[PDB]
Chain A
Amino acid sequence: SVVVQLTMAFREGTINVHDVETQFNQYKTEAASRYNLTISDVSVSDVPF
């Protein structure tokens, strides 16, 4: 398979790691239908930078 790793930036505020991960996992069905990407093994962490 292809492992994909990246960092995201959000404007300061209330958005937290649960918000980010939940939105991504909820999109899995659309990733498959729209991008034909079968997405698994999602891992999200806070990082200082």
Chain B
Amino acid sequence: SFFFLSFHISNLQFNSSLEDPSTDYYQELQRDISEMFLQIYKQGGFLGLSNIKFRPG
């Protein structure tokens, strides 16, 4: 099955870098959050997650 998930990271500022998928900071945050998800769901059932969308909150 597929599941959409939205959450807030309350201790990071949204900034112009996170508006631009090509920046080092955007790519680093997307990578690190993706890694985190693989750790949360460290089972054979979890295949992966999509590209991440960042929005100002």
Interface residues on chain B, size class = 35 or more
Contact at A10–B45, with CB atoms within 8 Å?
A: yes
Contact at B5–A8, with CB atoms within 8 Å?
A: yes
- A27–B41 Cα distance when bound, in Å, is 10
User: How many interface contacts (CB-CB < 8 Å) are there between A and B?
Assistant: 146
Contact at A35–B53, with CB atoms within 8 Å?
A: no
**How would you classify the secondary structure of chain B's contact residues: helix, strand, loop or mixed?**
mixed
- A3–B6 Cα distance when bound, in Å, is 7
Chain A residue contacts of B44, Cβ below 8 A: 11
- A5–B18 Cα distance when bound, in Å, is 13
Q: Residue B16 at the A interface, CB < 8 A?
A: no
A4-B54, A6-B52, A23-B41 as given contacts; A46 in contact with B36, CB under 8 Å? no
Closest 3 CB pairs of A and B: A1-B57, A3-B57, A3-B55
